[PDB]
RNA sequence: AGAUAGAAAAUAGGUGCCCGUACCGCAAACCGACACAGGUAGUCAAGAUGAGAAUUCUAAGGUGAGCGAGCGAACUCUCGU
RNA sequence: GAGUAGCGAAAGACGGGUGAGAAUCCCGUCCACCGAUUGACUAAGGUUUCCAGAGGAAGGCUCGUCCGCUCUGGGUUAGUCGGGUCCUAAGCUGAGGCCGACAGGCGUAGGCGAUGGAUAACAGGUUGAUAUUCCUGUACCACCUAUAAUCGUUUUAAUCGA
RNA sequence: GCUGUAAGUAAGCUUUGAUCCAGAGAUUUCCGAAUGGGGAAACCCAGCAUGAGUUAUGUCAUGUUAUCGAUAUGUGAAUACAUAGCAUAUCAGAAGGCACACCCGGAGAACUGAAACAUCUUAGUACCCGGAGGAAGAGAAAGAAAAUUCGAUUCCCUUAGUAGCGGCGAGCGAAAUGGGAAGAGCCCAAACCAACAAGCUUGCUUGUUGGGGUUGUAGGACACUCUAGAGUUACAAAGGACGACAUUAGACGAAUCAUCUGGAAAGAUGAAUCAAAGAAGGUAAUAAUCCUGUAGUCGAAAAUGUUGUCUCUCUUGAGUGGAUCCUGAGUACGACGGAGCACGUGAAAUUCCGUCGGAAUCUGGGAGGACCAUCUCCUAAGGCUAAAUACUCUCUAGUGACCGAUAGUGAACCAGUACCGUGAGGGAAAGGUGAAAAGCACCCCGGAAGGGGAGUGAAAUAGAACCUGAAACCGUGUGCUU
């Protein structure tokens, strides 16, 4: 725990524009909230985060040549540490 | 890899539990951010940490069923 | 059945009366590529991973059926037994002693 | 709808008519509902006027 | 009714979770097998004329309709005399 | 049947550009239609059709460089908005109970259930896609901790309450 | 050697024994009887205890909490004891599923046949629900019968489409005998009992405490006299301890070479060989001798069915009198209405249900198709019981004058899927390049799709829509015609 939901970061257009400012973004567990977020990365990375935002993706439909099938459902989580840098090298 | 593992003192086998978690966390947080290549590490860290606890489990397996 | 380094002699295809030794097994289809047996010419394109191309000359597989084991000692194509040597299941010529297998 | 005691419960049959013409019926017993002794404490339960005959007490 | 030695007061610090949020919605994303002349609750709804949410033109803002180019016979359809 | 019927209400013209190809795609000017609406919102429903690149077999009643099509990569951020959280109507369930050939039906206490009642955030900026959600400004509602300027038999109180 | 399909390219792993294959174990999200409460399955929302976290709050982790049922404690009304009722504790107690089968019940059609139709038939069939068990039901004579006995039952063959029942219509239709498979028998109530044990006052009564003996040669107590094998499939009922084959991995396993044609031989030709193996499938064509195997033999750490025993656990066997006593009560049986018997209410036995009545106790009771008298047989109204018998979701091995892609499963192929319907439900179409992917390097036209060379291959009118490639149908030439 406190390391089993941060699955991957996230490094797209948007996530980076979020991270010219201190928001970091992250694809985190689907049965987490916002409060299990804000702890596991301040005590991963001793940041000091001040406040987090969650979203819920819907499963995407993906046609896979004759088969089709549906992408995995995505919970997202945005961080806006005050204190700290989250790096992703 | 599970003779030394027996031979480990069931304490500090579940910190590294810990560390193997740990180290799986890494690993995967640089694959997504592309800097990883060797992700055949990937599965020896889940085979040592799934041996890992099948040995704490059958540490406490035997105890609870003898006494 | 056969090992993945001795030298074996075909007997069917275009290939026989030839020697040569194996160098891959796939057990799964039940064929050797034997050493200039069953020479291709197949034709690669200019790619990225192989920058140009041409018409390569590999080896292609042939059914274990159509390859046979050499006797060591008279060079003649033989099939091959067993003996149990320290409960060990070594190799046997068949019509000779023991028939090594190292490489 | 049993007895309480024996167990006399309904049943079917036919009603009959003069051309032999059937239809389905039922005979019930002659449930009588009693105040009796059981399992210590009075209860109130049906019980048939063949059960009451001779053996039971209210 | 009970319950209890406690904080209200005039501050200063912190904490606030889960589900929905894109897009269409008088519509080529909905109910009609269709990029269908039908149906689809509610909110805002300007100017000139008027009594008016009528009527004609227009503002804000959308749109030119997923086949065309000719010739302007018969015969149908819509319209005027 | 026959290269026949049909091409599904309507106003287009022209210059420039793009391409293998243009009445049909992009830009511009003019013209025209709606305007208690073909305009802006928001529900129900559909689920990715949304956005940016790229493609042209197929789908678009023609063509197509175009698209609600195909390929790749992206996009939905709330203590205050709508719900959960609070309440209940019509109905639906219903422990025990009543009735029932079995199956089961009915029903009390109690629950569930909005189309209703009660509930604290406003303005501006912002990208290709989101914004009472993000950011700038200023707020408000609950909760907790430290402190309290003396409330004062802790029965009554500063005041705790079915 | 491996990293499934399923190709990939990239990291790897493996003789220090990987991937495999068997046995055993661990983990096993969420929903679902679903069970903490709710709910539009796969989601929300909690109480309690213990822990993590935080200065605290928020937050999190692991247990626990449904309803009946049984039992055990408390507590306890309208009411005085008491009884409801409440509250705890316990309990591998019950739920639900299914094989679209077989079995036993509850309940029960209709079309149809009668050349109409109502009795009748379809048919106690279909469909419903309830129980099951691997089998179930039945089962130790109140029997069959006229010699006596299958001496329990079941099932098969025959009796036999006979006897019979039938608006005597359409139809329906036995049983005994005899021939077989398989066979097995038992336990209780009652009397009585030294007692025991409570009531009730020790006079007795009643109890499960227990014994006792369960049967027609009439059995048992009784009184005499006498004497210490069973079995967990009924016959009480538990479980360690040794073996024995078999089954859920496997191992060994005979004997062929040459030429010819070929793209390749297993074919042809010649010469051999093995056979407890010439079953079968592969292999570049048709193989006993090339491969996997086959006959034969061998083989389990383990976890199972199974079985020999050794334990073990149980424990009375007879006779003779017969004075008394006992031998299954609201029962048999009768009446009424129905149902069941092959048998339609009939002369209607035999048998069951509802409703009223209602018996005998061996010096008795029931049956022998109205029936009786006599004879013969039997001994009800309590219980248990294996085998022969029925069936196949499975698993294992194998078989087929069974099917070969419009067939055979609806389904050879990601099929109960596209799809259709609000939903029950309905429900497809679709296999084949080659031996090997050798899957067509380059060049030429074209934006591309295509093509034309060259090359691969035996073959490319085998180029991926790919074996053979018919007809309808559409074209391009033309000899003879108009």
Redesign the interface.
Same mark, same amino acid.
């Given at each position: 725990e406190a $390391?089993?939901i941060?699955? $991957?970061?996230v490094?797209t257009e948007k996530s980076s524009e979020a991270m010219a400012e201190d928001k970091y973004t992250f694809?985190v567990d689907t049965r987490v909230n916002k409060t299990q977020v804000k702890m596991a990365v301040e005590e991963i990375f001793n940041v000091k985060v001040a406040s987090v935002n969650i979203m819920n993706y819907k499963p995407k439909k993906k046609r896979m040549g004759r088969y089709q099938g549906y992408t995995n459902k995505r919970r997202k989580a945005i961080v806006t540490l005050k204190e700290g840098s989250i790096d992703?090298? | 890899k599970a003779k030394e593992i027996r031979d480990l003192t069931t304490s500090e086998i579940e910190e590294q539990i810990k560390s193997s978690?740990?180290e799986l966390?890494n690993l995967?947080? /640089?694959?997504?951010?592309g /800097?990883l290549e060797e992700t055949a590490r990937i599965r020896t860290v889940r085979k040592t940490i799934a041996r890992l606890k099948t040995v704490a489990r059958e540490r406490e397996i035997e105890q609870s069923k003898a006494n | 059945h056969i090992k993945k380094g001795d030298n074996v002699k075909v007997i069917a295809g275009k290939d026989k009366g030839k020697e040569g030794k194996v160098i891959a097994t796939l057990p799964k289809k039940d064929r050797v590529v034997v050493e200039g047996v069953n020479i291709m010419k197949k034709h690669q394109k200019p790619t990225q991973l192989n920058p140009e191309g041409g018409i390569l000359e590999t080896e292609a597989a042939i059914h274990v059926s159509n390859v046979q084991l050499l006797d060591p000692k008279t060079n003649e194509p033989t099939r091959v037994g067993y003996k149990f040597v320290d409960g060990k299941k070594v190799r046997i010529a068949k019509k000779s002693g023991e028939e090594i297998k190292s490489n | 709808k049993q007895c309480f005691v024996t167990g006399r419960k309904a049943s079917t049959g036919n009603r009959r008519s003069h051309a032999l013409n059937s239809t389905k019926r039922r005979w019930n017993a002659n449930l009588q509902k009693v105040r009796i002794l059981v399992d210590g404490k009075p209860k109130k339960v049906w019980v048939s006027a063949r059960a009451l005959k001779s053996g039971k007490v209210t």
């Open positions: $390391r089993d941060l699955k $991957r970061p490094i694809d992703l090298f | 978690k740990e966390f995967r947080f /640089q694959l997504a951010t /800097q | - | -």
